[model samples]
Target chain A: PKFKRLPGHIAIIPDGNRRWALDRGLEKHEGYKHGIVPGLELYDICVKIGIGEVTFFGFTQDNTKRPQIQRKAFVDACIKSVKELSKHDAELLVVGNTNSDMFPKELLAYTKRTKFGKGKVRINFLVNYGWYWDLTYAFENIENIASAEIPRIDLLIRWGGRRRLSGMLPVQTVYSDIYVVDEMWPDFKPEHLFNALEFYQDQ
Target chain B: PKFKRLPGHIAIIPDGNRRWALDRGLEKHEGYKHGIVPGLELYDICVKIGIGEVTFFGFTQDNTKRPQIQRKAFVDACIKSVKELSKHDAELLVVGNTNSDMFPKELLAYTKRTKFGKGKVRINFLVNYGWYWDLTYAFKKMIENIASAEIPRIDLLIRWGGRRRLSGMLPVQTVYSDIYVVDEMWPDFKPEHLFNALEFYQDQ
Candidate 1:
């Protein structure tokens, strides 16, 4: 099938992982375990389908407040995810509040942009991210959308039943086509991404 | 009907007016004309229910693109409605970029702030409001909200017709707001819908 105007950037808030695990009577930490792999798979899918930029909301500053065991699991999983993702040929940039005590120091090594195998895609991993920092920087250069480190988002998909900003990357999402899916992060399929693209084409 | 907690502020994006009119085999402008009255009734209902503030998204920066005649008609109707709404003690404030050529000149009078009959309920009419101005203020407000440890949080944000995303109201809706997207079109929105939304919010 022919497609028109595939989005340049796609941002995702992969939520409801903990709920996904709890519903099945598993540990909360297990949710992040199951949730973390889809991003890697989706990046490959997005690149193959010709989407230039793919941003995954890996972790937030607020998410660090989860029990020590759960937070550690996310931090460990994100570090592992980033390490594994470097195998793919994407210009990878990891951003977030690295200074926070709650943030995993292991992930801080990715504070700067790293070029993966080659450069077919731009990959952004937002770990320990918060809205206030992004908002402040964007406001200083209000006239220029390029002022912020993050690129302008074309579509922001949140894979959870809830509809909210949730202190997500508000500065990058000024005019994004927000898509909320009922499926949890762990269960997100490639079909969901295509469905969002179809909707984006219509918009 | 009995309710647990009434919202302190009710912000609504009264959308789907054009669709509403077209669905009825009426002119698109006819939808806005019919859509205007429900807000008036809601304001009165809110006042009676002890709601402190109500903001209605009457126009956006994009809405000025209608045919010249239709735009003029909407501006005139909005001006007339504001005049009538002032009699209800709303502490009326109409905010938007009046500098735009599309904006009605008369609304400039109420741009800053106007004292309604009394100060019981503050009614804000957003005409030609874009996210840019709101974002600028929000940045400044953020510093204050941090220093003072407070911010104006909306309890409920309702959108008529069933669109999920909050288009231009992102700055104010940064807080954990209970979003209520009503399935009915704006022209058909009634007091009962508001009540149901409030009930949903109370649970949240």
Candidate 2:
């Protein structure tokens, strides 16, 4: 007999854009665009592998502080991706502290459009991101509304060269299981996604 | 066609020893001892699978601050593990920021006795009691050293209700490259080590 194992949930911090572009003599927006493919591919693979939940760091709170041109490009790409995912019948759950005011109208509209409706696969897009903020939200919801066990992170996949996760929430010490991948979000491939999942399964 | 992948470097933060002991209606030391076997089994498998590196967070700088009896038991176990590994021909590296004064003389002597002379499998042991201290040391090294290209990371390997990690090191982020596991540590890893990590590469 053999033991069967799989990851129930996965989180990713898609990092690195400027460096990726600089390395290729491409514009920053080009680098940002490159990351979209891998990000979407990761989501596709997760669903195919029977993963129940997938969370992505689509945009960060700090991203709103970037220059307008750069920030707009990022937000546009995010909205575009959601629109693309919506076409596939994928559901979206926007996690984190989002500043709708900072986001463009079309992006906000797209976010609103993709959020509800029945679906087989759900994508939790953690915008206005921070681990602590997410955990706080989870804690409040768990404590006030439900008695379900706090979902333990089965695997954490970080894309981008930037190392070190902001220990935003104190609960990090309790959620230890993680997998960090150094590939920039743009370059993350299905193989990379499967590799991360397989590693977690073996553990 | 499909390929296989596995976690190469598994880092484990052995937590809840005392808690496990309390819940089981047993002494903390007993729980610690019980934890040892499974950990050893994991290590044995790592060696068998030919994984490149396996690290264990056996003792942290905080653990050193625990009650004398509990701390002593841990140190004793550390000495025993090192002594046992001394017989293997692997390389060993000890990473920590402990004040030598705080450790017992006998334990220190035992640690000293485990030499890297030759024909011994290398073991890298890190004992920074707290994550902050480990991060601080890493930052200092990064600042002082000019040639170091590694970015430091405090990775979390959440598994079976506990999270383990290899703090103060940069993570490898290549798109399609050799796979490394940053979650599980030495004592509780096995042959599945290479299997998981290699499988990752094959998929890439």
Candidate 3:
């Protein structure tokens, strides 16, 4: 498929890492570790594809449920993922409620992380992001302040079989087209993304 | 074909009336008029199936591009739908920002439309309900507008016109919804379609 068109913005829910680990009978953290290379590979692919903006749901407020060892591994992978992504030429943004205690301090670099890399690709990493928090912030500061608004998501690709987003970004995804792939994130190949992008074009 | 479970809320965007008419070589507004019956029939099906709550997207802002005759048909259908729905035992609410120029005052009576029967069904008619208005409400009245309109958690949102986009539905309400897009136009919708949606929801 000669897929040249790209959505102005894409949001990804990289799920099934733990499931991939369990599928292989390895420690849950192993799934998080395996997801790292693919996560970076997607960035390289996106840059080549010339997708202007992308957001990744890196950690959720609800992710603390992972037993401590697994939780730390996922957090460590997220922290390291930011540093690894910085090596690429693009702008990076880590969006989340850093106020929460569960937020790993190693990600402090991403608290206000931004970089203009040589590439025009724009990246967003959602760390401690919570929809409730975003809503509450808007509600509380209705008078004086405003955060950079998220662009309307054109395509939301969830790399797992789950049918629900569990409230990803309540505002940005209002009209976003959704594509679900049954492949685990670790196993999610570039072709799967190409397929999802093509499917969105048809929508 | 067996469906035992019911979604907490079901919202329907009954689109394609005009297209249905155009398909049959009838006037476009004729399709909108014919849609009136099936609209009520869906409520009857929902009530029978024990659906707790339902919202119907009757029209939107862009619909005014239609001519006067077609416009009145949609407005009249919405008003009559509410009045007809009142005979059933239920609490009815009409939600939308009436401040807009596109809103029809003749249909204002349906805003809080209501009736009470022995069933536990609750119905909401969204006339001139644009999501832009909802967002503005949350912004201006963020402190006070504690849902001047109640947007429920839509477990199953069915748009019978075969369109994939939700098209300005209240954002918060659609977060986890199972959107089932049927190819049949709104008038072509049947109880079987609702049941099929329920079956899909059961799988979900």
Ranking by TM-score: 3, 1, 2
Candidate 3, A1-203: lDDT as tens digits: 46756798988888999889989999777898887898889888887778888888887787777688988888888888888888878677777777778877776675554675685777787887766565557655522222245567888888867656566776677678778788899997999889888887776
Please estimate how well model 3 matches the true structure, expressed as its whole-model Cα lDDT.
0.77
* DockQ metric, candidate 1: 0.35
| Model 1 C-alpha lDDT per residue in residues B86-183, reported as the tens digit of each score | 77777888877666786678777877667766767887777877766566554433534331122255668888986755666645454456678887
DockQ, 0 to 1 scale, candidate 2: 0.07
Measured with C-alpha atoms, the lDDT of residue A138 in candidate 3 is: 68
Off by over 4 Å in 1: A1-5, A138-147, B48-50, B65-67, B98-103, B112-115, B118-120, B137-151, B170-172
Please give the CA lDDT of all the candidate structures: 0.75, 0.52, 0.77
Predicted structure with the largest DockQ when compared to the true one: 3
Error of 3 at A173 (Å): 1.8
Best candidate, TM-score: 3
Give the interface RMSD of candidate 2. 11.3
lDDT for B62 in candidate 2 is 54
Off by over 4 Å in 3: A27-29, A142-147, B1-4, B18-22, B25-30, B62-73, B138-149
Interface RMSD to the true structure, each candidate: 3.3, 11.3, 3.6
Clashing pairs in 1: none
Q: What CA RMSD would you report for each candidate?
A: 3.6, 11.9, 3.1
